[PDB]
């Protein structure tokens, strides 16, 4: 089959001389390729789960052979419960081959055709071409692996065993099932996107030019409540969103939220849009909304973490350093597990409340002086395609991006505290990075004038090229903040989907109403002053709970970290 020409990644090629980074890279390649061909594990929550599984297998394969001192493996060889019993090396002492076996096994089990019956129903929707393209990636990775891959080594085979255990334990074949789900229309209720109410999909994935059929997609409505958590030691909840349940009386907040939504997230040319060109850039920068050759958010977070990892490594040698190998193996397991669980809980809460997206909220508001029945958002960028901006096929509260970011960056903060600088775990850090480029704005990717051609490199395809923007950030606190507000700029998130409006916006004399500048644009607090303290109530539970994605993510990362990356007790699994 003709291999898809993938655009070059903006990252020093030296990174991939390290085998932990290399295998992470392979996972990221599969992420973007599966989103280009429509293969398995697409979408935000499941793509995160795949990386968590990959790094958990790598983590245990490496630390079994090269025992850690300050912590232990995720699973142990002395577990009485077979499902949680980690294989023993028994002579295997080649960590490089152990990691290779684990990585190759896990990725193969995850992305290759589920010949073992699972092909029916679950996988019965992915074309053979999709599997073919994914296989190419895996195949050449074996050939590109630093130091080579010796499939005959005992160490390699051991790694495979490790992967088998994690796969059988954590894989959720029916994770993205939507069978039986249907929206419950009403005020504040999620329903089909007015801009993309239905889509025509081919009856046969293997014949994309043959007959189509109307399809209404709902992204993983049961995943969050039914799936097996990775390392969380409890269930996490958020305050009821403004307008619902115990907070149904929070009308001033909601009304002002509608106001901020129109001004900050509308289409570029609308007269009501007050968002600045720089804010528009911040919005697209963090997108990674499952586009061709780009993938989902977890991919970008890992790209950023890769830079942080190399920028703050203890030893200069990327290739031959056990200090670096252990550091990277540990960091990525923590980060990707935090990301996986953040995906589980953001999705659990998303479908729990089924809060509508700003587009529907503004349009269907119903009040002549509040809504705009013809409003349009900047929307999720339809990169490397000729389709128009959409909005993620799932509820708004909390923001998936915000939760993912909260988890990933709080983990990075907990991990590097006292090493890169010193800070209170709930206050701004100094983990700066520069030369950070998003593939949404890299001077290569673009908005095509015609349908994407997978046999030609993106550069040879007519379209409007995305401006290349090279960024520098002063801290993971900033990354966390900007990743969250980018969704407000795209018009896909309400302000409270990110965090409590009181913690991120500039207040006025009127309660629940926030400051705007001379030209109407919403004013945000300085990153250094932001503290996620404001909590709210839940109708179904006593106590105060976090508001928005960022606080939820922070909470998840702290818990996992504080427990040293320990499996979720099976007793508390769904
Ligand atoms: O994925 V989002 O909920 O941030 O649109």
From Swiss-Prot:
One of its GO terms (cellular component) is extracellular region. Vanadate binds at residues 350, 357, 399-401, 487, 493. Its EC number is 1.11.1.10. Keywords: Chloride, Metal-binding, Oxidoreductase, Peroxidase, Secreted, Vanadium. It is an enzyme of class 1 (oxidoreductase). InterPro entries: Br/Cl_peroxidase_C, P_Acid_Pase_2/haloperoxi_sf, V-haloperoxidase, VCPO_N. GO terms for molecular function: chloride peroxidase activity; metal ion binding. Homotetramer. This is Vanadium chloroperoxidase. It comes from Curvularia inaequalis (Helminthosporium inaequale).
């Amino acid at each position: 089959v003709t291999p898809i020409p993938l655009p070059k990644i903006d990252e020093p090629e030296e990174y991939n001389t390290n085998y932990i980074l290399f295998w992470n890279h392979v996972g990221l390649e599969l992420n973007r390729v599966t989103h280009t061909v429509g293969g398995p594990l697409t979408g935000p929550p499941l793509s995160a789960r795949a990386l968590g599984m990959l790094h958990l297998a790598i983590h245990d394969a490496y630390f079994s052979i090269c025992p850690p001192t300050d912590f232990t493996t995720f699973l142990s060889p002395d577990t009485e419960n077979a499902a949680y019993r980690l294989p023993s090396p028994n002579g295997a002492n080649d960590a490089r081959q152990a990691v290779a076996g684990a990585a190759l096994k896990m990725l193969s089990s995850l992305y290759m055709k589920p010949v073992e019956q699972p092909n029916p129903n679950p996988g019965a929707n992915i074309s053979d071409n999709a599997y073919a393209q994914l296989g190419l990636v895996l195949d050449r990775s074996v050939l590109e692996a630093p130091g080579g891959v010796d499939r005959e080594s005992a160490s390699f085979m051991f790694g495979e065993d490790v992967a088998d255990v994690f796969f059988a334990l954590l894989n959720d074949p029916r994770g993205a099932s939507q069978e039986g789900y249907h929206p419950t229309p009403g005020r504040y209720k999620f329903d089909d996107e007015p801009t993309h109410p239905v889509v025509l999909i081919p009856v046969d994935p293997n014949n994309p030019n043959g007959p189509k059929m109307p399809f209404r997609q709902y992204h993983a409505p049961f995943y969050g409540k039914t799936t097996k958590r990775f390392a969380t030691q409890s269930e996490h909840f958020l305050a009821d969103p403004p307008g619902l349940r115990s907070n149904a009386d929070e009308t001033a907040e909601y009304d002002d939220a509608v106001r901020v939504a129109i001004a900050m997230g509308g289409a570029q040319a609308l007269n009501s849009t007050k968002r600045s060109p720089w804010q528009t850039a911040q919005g697209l920068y963090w997108a990674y909304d499952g586009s061709n050759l780009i993938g989902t958010p977890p991919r970008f977070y890992n790209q950023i973490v890769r830079r942080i990892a190399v920028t703050y490594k203890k030893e200069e040698d990327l290739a031959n350093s056990e200090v670096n190998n252990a550091d990277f193996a540990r960091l990525f397991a923590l980060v990707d597990v935090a990301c996986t669980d953040a995906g589980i809980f953001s999705w659990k809460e998303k479908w729990e409340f089924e809060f509508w997206r700003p587009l529907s909220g503004v349009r269907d508001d119903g009040r002549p002086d509040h809504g705009d029945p013809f409003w349009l958002t900047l929307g999720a960028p339809a990169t490397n395609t000729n389709d128009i901006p959409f909005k993620p096929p799932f509820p708004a509260y909390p923001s998936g991006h915000a939760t993912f970011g909260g988890a990933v960056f709080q983990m990075v903060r907990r991990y590097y505290n006292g090493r890169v600088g010193t800070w209170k775990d709930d206050e701004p850090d100094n983990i700066a990075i520069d030369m950070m480029i998003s593939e949404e704005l890299n001077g290569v990717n673009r908005d095509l004038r015609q349908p994407y051609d997978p046999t030609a490199p993106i550069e040879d395809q007519p379209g409007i090229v995305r401006t290349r923007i090279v960024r520098h950030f002063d801290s993971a606190w900033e990354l966390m903040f900007e990743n969250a507000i980018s969704r407000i700029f795209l018009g896909v998130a309400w302000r409270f989907d990110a965090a409590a409006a009181r913690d991120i916006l500039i207040p006025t004399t009127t309660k629940d109403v926030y400051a705007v500048d001379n030209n109407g644009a919403t004013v945000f607090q300085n990153v250094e002053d932001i503290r996620y303290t404001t909590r709210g109530t839940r109708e179904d539970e006593e106590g105060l709970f976090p508001i928005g994605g960022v606080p939820l993510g922070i909470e998840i990362a702290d818990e996992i970290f504080n427990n040293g990356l320990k499996p979720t007790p099976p007793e508390i699994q769904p």
